[PDB]
Structure formats: structure tokens, C-alpha cells
Point group: C3
Chain length 136, copies 3
């Protein structure tokens, strides 16, 4: 099965759980796509089912919370890429980035809040990824 | 044919047509890619040729118009994801987002301006998408 | 081989080289992915190994440097798409865009800084792309 893809969104203003405060992981409640069921909605983590090149994209949308944030795409406790978002009232802004990375079976991909907080919720945030092609 | 992909850009300063004012749809005049010819440039809509997982990306670039905007990727006239863009003169701002969604044959994907306007044009804006992989009748239909 | 993909990032605060000032090309020092080895790290340019539809994405992250910038994706010395980024101190912001384009073998893809400068470095910047599917004559 070379068909692997997932897509998740934050669909509500709801505040960060105590677990979020603890783990600093950005959680996505609603999953539009999860072929291969390789994305664990509970931990909001993608576990690669096989060795290959995966694509990832994320947009973390925040509101005026008096805070500036930094989101990082994580690979097994290692940062791959980072995105930033300032603080102002006129609009929402997004910490967005994307990348191709090689993953091994059982490698974990997820988003971490490296800085700031997501008070006021992070509605409209998105996290998606898919296997571009596998490797031997 | 599992090869399906399209790419369109806004290449001019030109203002929104009177049609745009009514439909609130973001139109892209120049098409760089349209394999399968499933993207109709005139109405700027992607009609899925088959059931599968599709990727979509868009960057809507605006100029200072005293309004803040919200762009949404639409699936059969209902929003899937949204992007925002502030109001600023020193620079252009982009309402950007992207997502993977399941589509059925005849499902329509396009960008609609949920709020604000694009006076001053939306030059350099981009909208693209492609079939990641198809699906058979074993998979249930998507909820949207 | 229909497997072609590359991914590069700017991992340091380091300033633009004297070469960068001349060519206006945005350079990425660290390569996360380069299947087919079609991405030249030295010149930060992707040379298409075959005719097909390629996907490209880039995020150029700048800091407060008294300048506003414009980054463009170049195809054989011609701009395809562009991105912009204002100037303010409260945060970093990114000039981001992406597109699908048809390329033939030997076509060159790279990022050029059309305006402003990247003093203060462009750390956390990203540039990636891959062959979606090939095409025949
Ligand atoms: C999480 O931390 C914030 C402070 O950043 C606090 O206001 C909030 O009550 C905490 N939420 C939970 C569920 O612990
Ligand atoms: C569209 O509406 C705006 C105000 O929302 C108006 O200024 C503009 O003139 C309208 N478009 C045209 C073509 O008249
Ligand atoms: C590159 O150019 C900028 C401004 O044009 C200048 O401040 C900087 O010193 C230059 N760097 C080198 C290495 O020439």
C-alpha cells in the first residue's frame, strides 16, 4: 500500500487542554482524511507505516493573545522546520511552513508549540501530510 | 488515468469583474497546468474526474484596500478551510492555506472570498491542486 | 525512475555572501532530501531530470532589517510566482508561495530575491519540490 495520507483541522475556539500545557503538542480535533489510519487523532501524531519520502504542511492560526508563538514540525523529538506568528488585533495570522522529509517505519511526526501559548484557541489551523513515494 | 493536476495564477492588477462582486469567487486568468483538463479557467473551478484524495494549495495576494479578507477553499459551495490577511500598505499580504480532501466524481473545488474585497487586484495569487491517489468503491463517501 | 524530490533549509543566522549580493539568489545550506540528486546545493538550483509536472514550495523567513522583500521562483531566469514580506520587529514573517509547473529536462528552478535584502539572515527558510508525475512527448 503506497497510498498514505492524512488531514486534520482545528475547528473550534476551545482552549488548550491541561495535557497541551504539559506536552506542548498542538492537537487537531477534526480529521478530514486518514488513509491507512496512520494518524493518531488522540495524540495528533503521524506514525509512518513504511520507509519513504513524506510531505507535510501545517498552518497554525492564532488570535490576539498578547503573545507571539513559534511552531515546529517534529520528527522523533527533533525539530525539522519552524514557523512564527506575531501579535496584533487587526487580524488572525498563521505560522505556516512545509517540507519533504525521509521517514522510517515507526517515525513520529507532529507539531510542537516551541514558544508562546494558544489562548483564544487555534481555530482554522490545519495539519496534513502524505507519502510521496516509498523507499527500499 | 491517475494523472490529474492543475495550476493557475493571477497575473494582472485588473479589478474584480461585476460577476465577481456577485459570486464572490476568486478567478485566475492564467493556467500554467491543467492535465486532464479538469480545471475550468473561465469559472475557476476544479471538477474531480474520479474518486480519490486531492491536494489543494492557494495563496491569495492582496493590496491595501482598507478591508481585511478571508479566503476559503470551497467544496460544493461549502467551506473546508480558511485563510486570512490583514490590512497593510507597506506590503502585500497573503491568505494562504492548503489541505488534503477526499472528493467524489463531479465534486467542485474553488476559492470563494468569504469576507472583504479584492480591490486593487490580487496579482501574484496562486491556486493549484492535484490527485494524490485515486480510491475504489471499497472506500465510503466523504462527509461534507 | 519516477521518484524525484528535494528539500532544503536555511539553518543559520549567517549573513548573505558577497556572491549572494551579486546573483540575488537565495541559498540553502542544509539539504534534508535530494532523491535523484537533482538539486545542486552549491547553486541552490533544481535541474529537472525529465519532462513532467513538478511541485514547488518555498518559505523565506526574514527578520527586521529596515527592508521589505520580494522572493520569486525562477524558471530558466524567468519569474513564475512571487511572495512578499513586510517589515516589523514584533515577529519574523515569511514570503511564501507554491505552484505546479511543467518542466522539460535541463530546466532550472531556483529562488531569487527581487527586492530588498536578507540582512540578519534568513534562518528557518525552506525550499522543497518533487515530481508529481512525468510526461511523454
Ligand atoms: C493552560 O495554561 C494557561 C496559561 O498559559 C492557563 O491559563 C490555562 O488555564 C491552562 N489550562 C489548563 C487546562 O490547564
Ligand atoms: C464590488 O463591490 C465593491 C464594494 O464591496 C465596490 O466598490 C465595487 O465597485 C464593486 N465592483 C464593481 C465592478 O463595481
Ligand atoms: C551585501 O549587500 C548589503 C547591502 O547591499 C551590505 O550591507 C552587505 O555588507 C553586503 N555583504 C557583502 C558580503 O558584500
Amino acid at each position: 500500500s503506497a497510498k498514505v495520507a492524512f488531514s486534520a483541522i482545528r475547528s473550534t475556539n476551545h482552549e488548550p487542554s491541561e495535557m497541551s500545557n504539559r506536552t506542548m503538542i498542538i492537537y487537531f480535533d477534526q480529521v478530514l482524511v486518514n488513509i491507512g489510519n496512520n494518524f493518531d487523532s488522540e495524540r495528533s501524531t503521524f506514525i509512518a507505516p513504511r520507509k519513504g519520502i513524506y510531505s507535510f504542511n501545517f498552518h497554525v492560526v492564532k488570535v490576539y493573545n498578547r503573545q507571539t508563538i513559534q511552531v515546529s514540525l517534529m520528527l522523533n523529538g527533533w525539530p525539522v522546520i519552524s514557523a512564527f506568528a506575531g501579535d496584533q488585533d487587526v487580524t488572525r495570522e498563521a505560522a505556516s511552513n512545509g517540507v519533504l522529509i525521509q521517514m522510517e517505519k515507526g517515525d513520529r511526526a507532529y507539531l510542537k508549540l516551541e514558544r508562546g501559548n494558544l489562548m483564544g484557541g487555534w481555530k482554522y489551523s490545519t495539519f496534513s501530510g502524505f507519502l510521496v513515494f516509498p523507499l527500499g
